[PDB]
From a paper:
Periplasmic binding proteins (PBPs) are the ligand-binding components of ATP-binding cassette (ABC) transporters and are sometimes associated with chemotaxis systems. Members of the PBP superfamily mediate the uptake and transmembrane transport of a diversity of metabolically important solutes in bacteria, such as carbohydrates, ions, amino acids, and polyamines, to name a few. Despite the wide variation in PBP ligand size and chemical functionality the two domain PBPs have a conserved αβ-fold, with each domain encompassing a central β-stranded core that is sandwiched between surrounding α-helices. Ligand binding at the interdomain interface induces a hinge-bending motion in which the two solvent exposed polar interfaces of each domain close down on and envelop ligands in a largely desolvated binding site reminiscent of the protein interior.
Here we report the first neutron crystal structure of a PBP, namely a maltodextrin-binding protein (MBP) from a cluster of three related proteins found in Thermotoga maritima (tmMBP). The room temperature X-ray crystal structure of the tmMBP complexed with maltotetraose was determined at 1.70 Å with an Rwork/Rfree of 14.1/17.5%. The final room temperature neutron structure was determined to a resolution of 2.10 Å and refined to an Rwork/Rfree of 24.3/27.3%. The neutron structure enabled the modelling of deuterium atoms at exchangeable sites on the protein and the bound ligand, as well as deuterium atoms on solvent water molecules. Importantly, the neutron structure also resolves the position and orientation of D2O solvent molecules within the substrate binding cavity, which were previously inferred to provide hydrogen bonding interactions in the earlier cryogenic X-ray model. The tmMBP binding site uses a network of polar amino acids to satisfy the hydrogen bonding potential of many of the maltotetraose hydroxyl groups. A total of 8 specific hydrogen bonds, defined here as mediated either through direct protein/carbohydrate hydrogen bonds or through directly-bound water molecules, are observed for the first two sugar rings (ring 1/R1 and ring 2/R2). A total of 4 specific hydrogen bonds are formed with the remaining two rings (ring 3/R3 and ring 4/R4). The differential hydrogen bonding pattern of the R1/R2 and R3/R4 subsites suggests the tmMBP has a bipartite binding site. The water molecules bound in the specificity subsite are responsible for forming 3 of 8 hydrogen bonds and are thus important in binding of saccharides in tmMBP.
Author numbering: 5 to 382
Write the structure that this text describes.
Amino acid sequence: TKLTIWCSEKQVDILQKLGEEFKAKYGIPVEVQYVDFGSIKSKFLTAAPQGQGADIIVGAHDWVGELAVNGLIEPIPNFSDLKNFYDTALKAFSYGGKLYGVPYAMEAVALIYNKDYVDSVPKTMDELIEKAKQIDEEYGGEVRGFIYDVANFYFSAPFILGYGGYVFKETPQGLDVTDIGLANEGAVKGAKLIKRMIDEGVLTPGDNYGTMDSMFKEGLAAMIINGLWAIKSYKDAGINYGVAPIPELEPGVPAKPFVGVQGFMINAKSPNKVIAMEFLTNFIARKETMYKIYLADPRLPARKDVLELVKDNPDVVAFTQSASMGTPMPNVPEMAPVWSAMGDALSIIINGQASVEDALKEAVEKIKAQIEKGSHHH
Ligand SMILES: OC[C@H]1O[C@H](O[C@H]2[C@H](O)[C@@H](O)[C@@H](O[C@H]3[C@H](O)[C@@H](O)[C@@H](O[C@H]4[C@H](O)[C@@H](O)[C@@H](O)O[C@@H]4CO)O[C@@H]3CO)O[C@@H]2CO)[C@H](O)[C@@H](O)[C@@H]1O
């Protein structure tokens, strides 16, 4: 009789502290295990059917459909505190008419900049590119003017979607997963802006999340694209940072980031589901508990009465502005192959191995082929 939780490095300390509180009040020990974020879903897909998955996992709402149709996460029954959560957060964790998690936070990326190098936020992507090149020259390559995880579709989406790409078409009958918008004229235009930044040398093909995040924390990157999950580490590193929406792609044409929702899901195969349900609906979901989570992991709260406490914080203001321009990630099982296909296309594009139009058409054909083959069933 023990509850086990898998989560990323950002939640481990606070969830272990809250787990000791739950042990004091209910008598049940809680063990929190770090698992790298990019492996949680894959490890759970192989472990849970074997009886070796955690009771509770913490992660992003795009996973919900794939996990639900494979029978691996438990629906959450209605409970009266749900009226206090934002509908956008509850819809993101809903699939097939059922709620499949308790959300704790919403998030989007934004432009994060180091005020020691950036005095005026660029208003357009053209101005950002010019400012990055000036920094690159001024400090002789010791400081990067602009860097981000370029070949990760999650981080490059604001440019693709902003110009009119889309993942699946919205219809009155739901998402049409045969109508994929990732190689339309808008997607091409957004992918060409990415290529232009490579060609002009402000990004490189080797740029990745770890080097971005490390360089910013060391004071050697002026401008990055990242989310609220990183800001505490940058405050703790003593960086004098600011946050703004991603600059418009052209005048009057905004970037359009994904919106994500982070949340708690229960393993349907757990022998401890009954206690896991109490933990989530009668302890984690409470206003006081959700505010403690915010203090340790300061993303946008999913409960309105907690957001109300922190709504004046300038980081909350800026990231709310970014998220307001965004679109929630789809959560249908068919999202699963999209990330790999688009990551491969972006790698090809930035390495000059194919034209933008060709690389995106190949990506869409590969996604269609995976959907047709039922790759999302395990
Ligand atoms: O096939 C490639 C990979 O595809 C899938 O990964 C997706 C995720 O499912 C998406 O949710 C998204 O991931 C974002 C994530 O939403 C966002 O929060 C952020 O993640 C933070 C994390 O919240 C934080 O706690 C800490 O751990 O830092 C993470 C950032 O390093 O950024 C993620 C993007 O990197 O997009 C990815 C695709 O990149 C699939 O689940 C994977 O298993 C698969 O490998």
